[PDB]
Design a protein around this ligand. Sequence first.
Ligand code: ETS
Ligand code: ZN
Length: 257
Amino acid sequence: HWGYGKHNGPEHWHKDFPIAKGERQSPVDIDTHTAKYDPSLKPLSVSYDQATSLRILNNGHSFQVTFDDSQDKAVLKGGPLDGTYRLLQFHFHWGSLDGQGSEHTVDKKKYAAELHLVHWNTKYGDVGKAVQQPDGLAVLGIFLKVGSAKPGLQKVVDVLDSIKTEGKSADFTNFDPRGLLPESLDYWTYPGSLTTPPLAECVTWIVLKEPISVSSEQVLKFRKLNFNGEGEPEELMVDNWRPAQPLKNRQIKASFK
Ligand SMILES: CCN[C@H]1C[C@@H](C)S(=O)(=O)c2sc(S(N)(=O)=O)cc21
Ligand SMILES: [Zn+2]
């Protein structure tokens, strides 16, 4: 029922999910002059060497790649986190034009897209329990700007025509998510929420400072996906981003000066 259109988009979500007007909603604008450098923050530890991707699917809101999270194969540790978080899936948010598409903004600047790598805290046993806890999820957010092609993204781009419409999925094994990371792991972090329904306030956000570059031809392929199912009127899957929400009583911390 919810989506990103005029009649079911983010301005309507509160009617079904009242937490939309909550105290720790995401995304937010990162004001770089107001963020606080925190020397107590540790470097991120990203251990994706043993990642096992399974499937790629169009869920009607985005496309996502899912991973085997039945063991500690691909994990995120360190940074602002206590304990071990397992990689579950990644997905993107993007725009109709190159000047919009990211969810987070930096000094009000929007990027062409935003990549979310979603991880859940293993102390809670399964992702469903984790979403009910204030430290249940950690999402690594990476900005995409348009420039040179990202070789590590091309395998994803090449299969999108096979999942054009809602509900379509395909086998997507042996994909290495390390190919999507920037060089630097410097980051901002703040406590927030899922950016789609159910909008649960269960996420430690880790947003990387360094964007990755993708080519115009790569992003164009994202824009050819459909929100609709096969045999419904065609509606292009674009602008699947939630606008920035009020920071309220939160401080954004930076790992770097
Ligand atoms: C379409 C629903 N997506 C929801 C529910 C679960 C799928 S999830 O994996 O906990 C997750 S992560 C994000 S985001 N955009 O904050 O990273 C949204 C979602
Ligand atoms: Zn997302």
